[PDB]
C-alpha cells in the first residue's frame, strides 16, 4: 500500500510555528516521488515510522532553518530531534501544481517569553523537538504586521504571570516557497 501525500497537495500550508505533521507507518513511500512534484532548492540531512512536517517558508531564510542556528526559527518555531536521522528540504511550488494555495505573507515567531507572577523573571520559551511553541495560542495563523506584540495574562492553573510573543513577517514571493521536515525512526 502507498502512503498518501494528498493532505499536503491541497490548501494553504501553515506557517512554520504551526507546522503540519503527517505520520506514516505500514506503507511504502518514495520521498523523491513526492519531491518530483516540487522544484527543490536546498536540502540538509543529518523503518518504523516516517514523520513529515510541512509549512510555508521563504527561501531567503534558509540560513535560519538549521539545527545549528541560534536564530528565532530554531529557538521559538520548529526544532527536529537530534537523535534520529533527519532531513530539511526547501522547495518551491511549480506553476502546474495549482491546488496548493498561497498565504498572504510568511510569518514566524521572533520572541516567546513567560513573565512570571513575581513581576521580575522573564523566561524565554525555547521550543522542544516535536512540539509547538507555547505561544501558538496567542500568535494568529498569519501575523498582521511585522513587529506585532501579542500578550495574555495566564490563570493560576496555568502558572500565573504573562505569556508574550513577538511576530515577524516576510513578503510573499511570486511562487509559494515551502519547508519540509523529515524524521525517520529505524527499528
Amino acid at each position, epitope marked *: 500500500v502507498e502512503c498518501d501525500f494528498s493532505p499536503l497537495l491541497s490548501g494553504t500550508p501553515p506557517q512554520v510555528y504551526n507546522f503540519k505533521r503527517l505520520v506514516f507507518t505500514n506503507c511504502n513511500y518514495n520521498l523523491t516521488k513526492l519531491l518530483s512534484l516540487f522544484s527543490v532548492n536546498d536540502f540538509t540531512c543529518s523503518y518504523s515510522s516516517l514523520i513529515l512536517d510541512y509549512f510555508s517558508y521563504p527561501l531567503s531564510m534558509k540560513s535560519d532553518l538549521s539545527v545549528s542556528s541560534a536564530g528565532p526559527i530554531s529557538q521559538f518555531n520548529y526544532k527536529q530531534s537530534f537523535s534520529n536521522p533527519t532531513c530539511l528540504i526547501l522547495a518551491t511550488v511549480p506553476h502546474n501544481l495549482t491546488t496548493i494555495t498561497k498565504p498572504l505573507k510568511y510569518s514566524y515567531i521572533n*520572541k516567546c*517569553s513567560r*513573565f512570571l507572577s513575581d*513581576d*521580575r523573571t*522573564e523566561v524565554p520559551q525555547l521550543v522542544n523537538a516535536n512540539q509547538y511553541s507555547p505561544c501558538v495560542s496567542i500568535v494568529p495563523s498569519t501575523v*498582521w*504586521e*511585522d*513587529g*506585532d*506584540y*501579542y*500578550r495574555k495574562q495566564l490563570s493560576p492553573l496555568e502558572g500565573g504571570g*504573562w505569556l*508574550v510573543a*513577538s511576530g515577524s513577517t516576510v513578503a510573499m514571493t511570486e511562487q509559494l516557497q515551502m519547508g519540509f521536515g523529515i524524521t525517520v525512526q529505524y527499528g
Partner: antibody, heavy 127, light 111 residues
Framework: QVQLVQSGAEVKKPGSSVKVSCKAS????????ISWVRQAPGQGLEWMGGIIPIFGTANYAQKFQGRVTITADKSTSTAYMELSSLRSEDTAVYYCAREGGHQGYCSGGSCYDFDYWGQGTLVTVSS | VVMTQSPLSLPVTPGEPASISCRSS???????????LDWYLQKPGQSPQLLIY???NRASGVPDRFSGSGSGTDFTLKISRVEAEDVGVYYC????????FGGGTKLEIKR
C-alpha cells in the same frame, strides 16, 4: 488603576543633558507600553518615543533620533527619558503616558491609546 | 503622515453641538480592520486625557456626549451638547506606525 508620578522640574544649561523619570503604579509594569510626549509653551503635543519594558525595545520619532534615550527599570517600575544637547527650543513640559492596557494586542509592537498621563515635568533650558 | 485638523478655534454656544475634523495624508485603516486615530482633550493647566481611541471607541468614563467616526483619511469628533467643562484644546492623533498629533482645536464658550 494606574498612576504615573514624574520627577520634579529642572533647569538645564544649553548643551547639557536632562534625565526625567516616571514611576508607575498598578498592573504589571513590564507588560505595557510607555511613551514620552512633550509640549513647548503655547504649542501642541509632540510624541518623542516609547518603550515596552519587557522587550527593552525603544522607538523614537525621527526628529528626536540620536538625541533621546528611553529606558525602563523593572526593579522600581520606572521609565526614563534622557535628552542630550539641550537647546532653548527644548524648553517644554515633558509627559509620560501609558497605554490603557485593554487592546487585545499591540500592532507593530506598541500600543498608543494614552489613557494614563503623568503630571508633567517642566524642563527649562537657559543660560 | 500629516494630520490636518480644522478649525483652529471653535467658539460654541453652550448646549449646541460641535464637530472637529481631522484629515490624514494617508489611510489610517489597518489590515486588522481598525482605524488608528485617537482624540485627546487638554483642559487648561491640565495633562492631556483620552476621549476616543481606534477611531470610534469611547474611553472609560468619557460621557456619552463624545463620539468619534470616520474611516480611511477623514475623521470627525462630535460633541452632542457642549458644556463649560468641555473647554480646552482637542488633538487628534494617528497611530498607524509612529504616533503624530494634529495641530489642535481650541474650543471656547461663545457669548
Amino acid at each position: 488603576q494606574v498612576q504615573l508620578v514624574q520627577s520634579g522640574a529642572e533647569v538645564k544649561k544649553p548643551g547639557s543633558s536632562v534625565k526625567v523619570s516616571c514611576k508607575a503604579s498598578g498592573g504589571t509594569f513590564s507588560i505595557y507600553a510607555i511613551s514620552w510626549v512633550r509640549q513647548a509653551p503655547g504649542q501642541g503635543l509632540e510624541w518623542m518615543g516609547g518603550i515596552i519594558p519587557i522587550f527593552g525595545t525603544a522607538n523614537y520619532a525621527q526628529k528626536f533620533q540620536g538625541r533621546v534615550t528611553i529606558t525602563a527599570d523593572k526593579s522600581t517600575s520606572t521609565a526614563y527619558m534622557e535628552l542630550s544637547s539641550l537647546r532653548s527650543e527644548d524648553t517644554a513640559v515633558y509627559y509620560c503616558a501609558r497605554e490603557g492596557g485593554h487592546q487585545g494586542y499591540c500592532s507593530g509592537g506598541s500600543c498608543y491609546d494614552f489613557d494614563y498621563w503623568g503630571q508633567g515635568t517642566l524642563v527649562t533650558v537657559s543660560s | 503622515v500629516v494630520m490636518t485638523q480644522s478649525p483652529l478655534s471653535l467658539p460654541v454656544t453652550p448646549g449646541e453641538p460641535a464637530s472637529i475634523s481631522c484629515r490624514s495624508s494617508q489611510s489610517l485603516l489597518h489590515s486588522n480592520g481598525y482605524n488608528y486615530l485617537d482624540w485627546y482633550l487638554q483642559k487648561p493647566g491640565q495633562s492631556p486625557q483620552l476621549l476616543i481611541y481606534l477611531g470610534s471607541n469611547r474611553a472609560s468614563g468619557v460621557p456619552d456626549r463624545f463620539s468619534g467616526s470616520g474611516s480611511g483619511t477623514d475623521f470627525t469628533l462630535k460633541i452632542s451638547r457642549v458644556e463649560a467643562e468641555d473647554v480646552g484644546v482637542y488633538y487628534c492623533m494617528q497611530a498607524l506606525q509612529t504616533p503624530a498629533f494634529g495641530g489642535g482645536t481650541k474650543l471656547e464658550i461663545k457669548r
